[PDB]
Ligand binder design. Sequence first.
Ligand SMILES: COc1c(C)cnc(Cn2cc(C#CCC(C)(C)O)c3c(Cl)nc(N)nc32)c1C
Length: 214
Amino acid sequence: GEEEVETFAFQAEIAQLMSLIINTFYSNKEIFLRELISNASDALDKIRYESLTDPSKLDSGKELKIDIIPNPQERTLTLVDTGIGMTKADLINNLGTIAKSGTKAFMEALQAGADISMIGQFGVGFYSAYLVAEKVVVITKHNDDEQYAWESSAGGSFTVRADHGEPIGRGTKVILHLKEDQTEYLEERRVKEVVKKHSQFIGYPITLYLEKER
Ligand SMILES: COc1c(C)cnc(Cn2cc(C#CCC(C)(C)O)c3c(Cl)nc(N)nc32)c1C
C-alpha cells in the first residue's frame, strides 16, 4: 500500500557493469568490503562535516559508527553506518546519473587491462557488492526525508519503496544476500582478516559482530 514498490530500469551502462561484475571470472571478490566500508566512511564524514555548521543534524543520532553483521542462517552480511543517508531522488535518479561516466570509464579501463579491484578509482564500488551478493537490499534514512528500501537482484532493474519497518534514525544499511559459493564472508574471522588487510585506518569505529552459530 503506502509501502508499494516501484520498479525502475538501471541506466544501460550500469546494467552492463553489473552484468560484467556478475559474469566475469574473477577470484579476488573480497574487495567488495573495502568499497562498502569506504562508502560508509564518506557518508559519515559528510554528516560530521554538516553537523559542524548545523548541530541539530545529529538529533537523529549522535553516534558515528559502522557495524558489520554476518548471519549464516539468513545468508546475509550487513553493513550499517550512521552516515548522512540517501534521499528518494538519490536512489531513483542521482546516484545512477552520476555513476554513468565512472561506469563507462571503468569498462574502458577494463578493456585496456585494468582489473576489477580498481572499481573504487571510478566512483562505482557499490556495485562490487554483486561479486558476492545475489541480491542487495539497502535501507536508508536521510534527515528531513523518510526511510526507504532499495533492492536489486540485478537483471537490469531495482525497486524503491517507503519503508515502515524498524527505524534506523539516520544512515544506511546495506544487506548482502550472499551467493551459495560465498559463505566465507558470513564468518567474523574472514571479515576481520579482510578489514585488517584493506580498511584498518578508517576514522570511525567498525564493530565486527560474531556470528552466534556457524
Ligand atoms: C542504493 O544503493 C546504492 C547505489 C545504487 C549506489 N551507490 C551507493 C553507495 N552510496 C551512495 C551514497 C550516497 C549518497 C548521496 C550524497 C553523496 C549526497 O550523500 C551512500 C551513502 Cl549516503 N551511504 C552509503 N553507505 N553508501 C552510499 C549505494 C548505497
